[PDB]
């Protein structure tokens, strides 16, 4: 039945610290899954059983040694946390018993959903999945990530189904350093990120607008980097304005066949200022989801990355899934549509458009109209 797909697996709940003081925990995917059923959207979507990702699948993004280290349970590089548990970092836990599996499952799930959508068996999909992936590098786990699920799906679409142009939109509040590195020289896949940057003083410290690509891939990496601190914080008004000026123009000109989304909900309301400190509303992610459904024919999947407040991620999930189904979205407050974006957001957008005009046609057409609000841009084009 041609519709919106979902992936979940309770086995992912097993990836927990051996002891809480961990923003990335089991109850994240669980409460999202309960929300989907409570609203009834799980009953409207087609569910798909997932699998562990084979080691060779993982080796399309990561080094052999890395894949062995955090993928296999046989029969060192581990650390003691300030909570008593085992980790590989001061941030990112490790369960010697249940982690390798759960991380490989998180990847495998976001290859089923992906291939099913891209193959024609489904319209589009949302993967309720943990641990996140976009921070995991070639040989380095970090930011709660072990394997870049989204980068693996992408690499496999290249190799199996042989898809020619792929587009990764990453809207987790942090930069996807992993996903960038994975394709930093590949022109066939466009990676564009929307992250709190603040001149490189925010995790993971990468993602300068300056960073555009190398070799054949130069100009196929777009870093919508938000500098300025939190005065005022970035909100709905600021992101919708970024999609309208940076994302959609570039993405449309690229015209991809598959759209992949590292959909972290760290940007929403109620997040402590170290974890995000942005004012995005859950309701808003719908419009961003909807705007991307216009691309590639609607061949789009969203993978859960970050987002830590339980109330926040459920809201933005149900909003995102409703958008993916084709439900009539709630109107964004008149307050929001009329609100102009702050001077910091405008400086950011303009710096990006400045660098990337050298690489895109429509960014050479106009002078900056980034300053306008939605209604003020809707009226000025009529
Ligand atoms: K991002
Ligand atoms: K690229
Ligand atoms: Zn712990
Ligand atoms: Zn994040």
mmCIF file of C-alpha atoms in Angstrom, residues 171-351:
data_model
loop_
_atom_site.group_PDB
_atom_site.id
_atom_site.type_symbol
_atom_site.label_atom_id
_atom_site.label_comp_id
_atom_site.label_asym_id
_atom_site.label_seq_id
_atom_site.Cartn_x
_atom_site.Cartn_y
_atom_site.Cartn_z
ATOM 1 C CA UNK A 171 18.312 20.273 10.322
ATOM 2 C CA UNK A 172 19.538 19.020 13.698
ATOM 3 C CA UNK A 173 20.708 22.093 15.657
ATOM 4 C CA UNK A 174 24.312 20.799 15.482
ATOM 5 C CA UNK A 175 26.471 20.477 12.353
ATOM 6 C CA UNK A 176 26.651 17.022 10.775
ATOM 7 C CA UNK A 177 30.450 16.864 10.565
ATOM 8 C CA UNK A 178 30.232 13.151 9.755
ATOM 9 C CA UNK A 179 27.828 13.529 6.822
ATOM 10 C CA UNK A 180 29.858 16.418 5.370
ATOM 11 C CA UNK A 181 33.193 14.539 5.503
ATOM 12 C CA UNK A 182 31.465 11.509 3.944
ATOM 13 C CA UNK A 183 30.752 13.411 0.728
ATOM 14 C CA UNK A 184 33.026 16.485 0.937
ATOM 15 C CA UNK A 185 34.371 15.682 -2.546
ATOM 16 C CA UNK A 186 31.274 14.110 -4.140
ATOM 17 C CA UNK A 187 29.270 16.243 -6.639
ATOM 18 C CA UNK A 188 26.507 13.608 -7.003
ATOM 19 C CA UNK A 189 25.268 14.296 -3.475
ATOM 20 C CA UNK A 190 24.441 17.725 -2.098
ATOM 21 C CA UNK A 191 24.815 18.116 1.650
ATOM 22 C CA UNK A 192 23.293 21.220 3.154
ATOM 23 C CA UNK A 193 23.191 21.918 6.881
ATOM 24 C CA UNK A 194 21.321 24.375 9.101
ATOM 25 C CA UNK A 195 23.175 24.622 12.408
ATOM 26 C CA UNK A 196 23.949 26.878 15.341
ATOM 27 C CA UNK A 197 27.501 27.878 14.460
ATOM 28 C CA UNK A 198 28.513 31.017 16.399
ATOM 29 C CA UNK A 199 31.927 31.434 14.695
ATOM 30 C CA UNK A 200 32.831 27.822 15.563
ATOM 31 C CA UNK A 201 32.146 28.123 19.300
ATOM 32 C CA UNK A 202 29.418 25.461 19.350
ATOM 33 C CA UNK A 203 29.483 21.643 19.077
ATOM 34 C CA UNK A 204 31.074 20.041 17.140
ATOM 35 C CA UNK A 205 32.956 23.208 16.104
ATOM 36 C CA UNK A 206 32.808 22.610 12.362
ATOM 37 C CA UNK A 207 30.556 23.858 9.568
ATOM 38 C CA UNK A 208 31.882 27.205 8.354
ATOM 39 C CA UNK A 209 30.006 28.719 5.385
ATOM 40 C CA UNK A 210 33.547 28.952 3.982
ATOM 41 C CA UNK A 211 33.537 25.114 3.693
ATOM 42 C CA UNK A 212 32.097 24.431 0.213
ATOM 43 C CA UNK A 213 33.778 21.219 -1.034
ATOM 44 C CA UNK A 214 36.877 19.976 -2.870
ATOM 45 C CA UNK A 215 37.591 18.653 -6.376
ATOM 46 C CA UNK A 216 34.502 17.658 -8.410
ATOM 47 C CA UNK A 217 32.336 18.215 -5.310
ATOM 48 C CA UNK A 218 33.283 21.879 -4.768
ATOM 49 C CA UNK A 219 30.150 23.987 -4.299
ATOM 50 C CA UNK A 220 28.005 20.959 -3.447
ATOM 51 C CA UNK A 221 28.306 21.452 0.320
ATOM 52 C CA UNK A 222 26.089 24.195 1.752
ATOM 53 C CA UNK A 223 26.583 25.270 5.365
ATOM 54 C CA UNK A 224 23.696 27.487 6.483
ATOM 55 C CA UNK A 225 25.725 28.504 9.507
ATOM 56 C CA UNK A 226 23.986 30.614 12.148
ATOM 57 C CA UNK A 227 26.376 32.998 13.894
ATOM 58 C CA UNK A 228 25.332 35.551 16.530
ATOM 59 C CA UNK A 229 24.751 33.801 19.850
ATOM 60 C CA UNK A 230 21.255 33.785 21.335
ATOM 61 C CA UNK A 231 20.306 37.491 21.175
ATOM 62 C CA UNK A 232 17.669 36.913 20.011
ATOM 63 C CA UNK A 233 17.558 33.105 19.585
ATOM 64 C CA UNK A 234 16.719 31.648 16.171
ATOM 65 C CA UNK A 235 13.051 30.701 15.796
ATOM 66 C CA UNK A 236 10.467 29.553 13.246
ATOM 67 C CA UNK A 237 10.638 32.913 11.472
ATOM 68 C CA UNK A 238 14.409 32.583 11.087
ATOM 69 C CA UNK A 239 14.396 29.047 9.637
ATOM 70 C CA UNK A 240 11.483 29.526 7.197
ATOM 71 C CA UNK A 241 13.417 32.557 5.969
ATOM 72 C CA UNK A 242 16.534 30.397 5.565
ATOM 73 C CA UNK A 243 14.673 27.724 3.593
ATOM 74 C CA UNK A 244 13.204 30.378 1.285
ATOM 75 C CA UNK A 245 16.553 32.098 0.613
ATOM 76 C CA UNK A 246 19.165 29.316 0.793
ATOM 77 C CA UNK A 247 17.767 25.765 0.838
ATOM 78 C CA UNK A 248 14.911 25.667 -1.733
ATOM 79 C CA UNK A 249 16.690 27.811 -4.392
ATOM 80 C CA UNK A 250 19.856 25.650 -4.250
ATOM 81 C CA UNK A 251 18.056 22.305 -3.848
ATOM 82 C CA UNK A 252 15.669 22.993 -6.742
ATOM 83 C CA UNK A 253 18.511 23.985 -9.081
ATOM 84 C CA UNK A 254 20.317 20.767 -8.086
ATOM 85 C CA UNK A 255 17.100 18.800 -8.799
ATOM 86 C CA UNK A 256 17.788 15.535 -6.905
ATOM 87 C CA UNK A 257 15.940 12.190 -7.150
ATOM 88 C CA UNK A 258 16.112 11.288 -3.453
ATOM 89 C CA UNK A 259 15.937 13.597 -0.430
ATOM 90 C CA UNK A 260 17.393 12.354 2.873
ATOM 91 C CA UNK A 261 16.901 14.285 6.110
ATOM 92 C CA UNK A 262 18.963 14.132 9.293
ATOM 93 C CA UNK A 263 15.984 15.363 11.298
ATOM 94 C CA UNK A 264 17.213 16.225 14.767
ATOM 95 C CA UNK A 265 14.803 18.202 16.921
ATOM 96 C CA UNK A 266 17.397 19.923 19.142
ATOM 97 C CA UNK A 267 16.328 23.268 17.663
ATOM 98 C CA UNK A 268 12.852 23.274 19.265
ATOM 99 C CA UNK A 269 11.605 24.987 22.448
ATOM 100 C CA UNK A 270 12.549 23.800 25.951
ATOM 101 C CA UNK A 271 16.155 22.830 25.248
ATOM 102 C CA UNK A 272 18.846 23.970 27.716
ATOM 103 C CA UNK A 273 21.106 26.526 26.027
ATOM 104 C CA UNK A 274 24.146 24.171 25.831
ATOM 105 C CA UNK A 275 22.091 21.524 23.938
ATOM 106 C CA UNK A 276 20.404 24.005 21.565
ATOM 107 C CA UNK A 277 18.900 27.225 22.936
ATOM 108 C CA UNK A 278 16.865 27.854 19.782
ATOM 109 C CA UNK A 279 13.184 28.835 19.759
ATOM 110 C CA UNK A 280 11.803 26.588 16.979
ATOM 111 C CA UNK A 281 8.294 25.245 17.508
ATOM 112 C CA UNK A 282 7.339 21.656 16.795
ATOM 113 C CA UNK A 283 4.452 22.751 14.554
ATOM 114 C CA UNK A 284 7.028 24.474 12.336
ATOM 115 C CA UNK A 285 8.942 21.354 11.279
ATOM 116 C CA UNK A 286 5.842 20.400 9.280
ATOM 117 C CA UNK A 287 6.301 23.317 6.869
ATOM 118 C CA UNK A 288 9.987 22.481 6.445
ATOM 119 C CA UNK A 289 9.064 18.832 5.833
ATOM 120 C CA UNK A 290 6.336 19.958 3.414
ATOM 121 C CA UNK A 291 8.698 22.267 1.496
ATOM 122 C CA UNK A 292 11.033 19.325 0.870
ATOM 123 C CA UNK A 293 8.194 17.035 -0.273
ATOM 124 C CA UNK A 294 8.078 19.347 -3.292
ATOM 125 C CA UNK A 295 11.548 18.110 -4.246
ATOM 126 C CA UNK A 296 12.486 14.832 -6.000
ATOM 127 C CA UNK A 297 8.815 13.913 -6.546
ATOM 128 C CA UNK A 298 8.380 13.365 -2.813
ATOM 129 C CA UNK A 299 11.039 10.662 -2.540
ATOM 130 C CA UNK A 300 12.034 11.696 0.964
ATOM 131 C CA UNK A 301 12.902 10.027 4.275
ATOM 132 C CA UNK A 302 13.568 11.538 7.676
ATOM 133 C CA UNK A 303 15.894 9.887 10.162
ATOM 134 C CA UNK A 304 15.744 10.793 13.851
ATOM 135 C CA UNK A 305 19.027 12.305 15.026
ATOM 136 C CA UNK A 306 19.096 14.673 18.028
ATOM 137 C CA UNK A 307 16.306 16.217 20.096
ATOM 138 C CA UNK A 308 16.305 15.527 23.806
ATOM 139 C CA UNK A 309 13.312 17.084 25.617
ATOM 140 C CA UNK A 310 10.640 14.362 25.580
ATOM 141 C CA UNK A 311 7.711 16.734 24.975
ATOM 142 C CA UNK A 312 9.535 18.474 22.112
ATOM 143 C CA UNK A 313 10.548 15.461 19.968
ATOM 144 C CA UNK A 314 7.097 13.858 20.124
ATOM 145 C CA UNK A 315 5.445 17.073 18.938
ATOM 146 C CA UNK A 316 7.866 17.542 16.044
ATOM 147 C CA UNK A 317 7.561 13.855 15.144
ATOM 148 C CA UNK A 318 3.756 13.864 14.914
ATOM 149 C CA UNK A 319 3.992 17.178 13.044
ATOM 150 C CA UNK A 320 6.567 15.721 10.627
ATOM 151 C CA UNK A 321 4.662 12.481 10.081
ATOM 152 C CA UNK A 322 1.360 14.359 9.507
ATOM 153 C CA UNK A 323 3.169 16.441 6.889
ATOM 154 C CA UNK A 324 4.553 13.266 5.256
ATOM 155 C CA UNK A 325 1.062 11.733 5.045
ATOM 156 C CA UNK A 326 -0.527 14.754 3.370
ATOM 157 C CA UNK A 327 -2.589 15.937 6.331
ATOM 158 C CA UNK A 328 -3.704 19.554 6.216
ATOM 159 C CA UNK A 329 -1.190 21.309 8.472
ATOM 160 C CA UNK A 330 -2.188 23.777 11.204
ATOM 161 C CA UNK A 331 -1.619 27.412 10.164
ATOM 162 C CA UNK A 332 1.548 28.949 11.621
ATOM 163 C CA UNK A 333 0.592 31.849 13.956
ATOM 164 C CA UNK A 334 0.044 35.233 12.270
ATOM 165 C CA UNK A 335 2.655 36.478 14.760
ATOM 166 C CA UNK A 336 5.249 34.153 13.150
ATOM 167 C CA UNK A 337 4.445 34.792 9.462
ATOM 168 C CA UNK A 338 4.526 38.560 10.007
ATOM 169 C CA UNK A 339 7.651 38.503 12.214
ATOM 170 C CA UNK A 340 10.826 39.660 10.461
ATOM 171 C CA UNK A 341 14.083 37.662 10.970
ATOM 172 C CA UNK A 342 16.728 39.108 13.328
ATOM 173 C CA UNK A 343 19.873 40.912 12.132
ATOM 174 C CA UNK A 344 22.054 37.953 13.120
ATOM 175 C CA UNK A 345 20.095 35.517 10.944
ATOM 176 C CA UNK A 346 20.297 37.986 8.061
ATOM 177 C CA UNK A 347 24.098 38.404 8.389
ATOM 178 C CA UNK A 348 24.425 34.615 8.330
ATOM 179 C CA UNK A 349 22.213 34.041 5.276
ATOM 180 C CA UNK A 350 23.935 36.841 3.364
ATOM 181 C CA UNK A 351 27.418 35.427 4.025
#
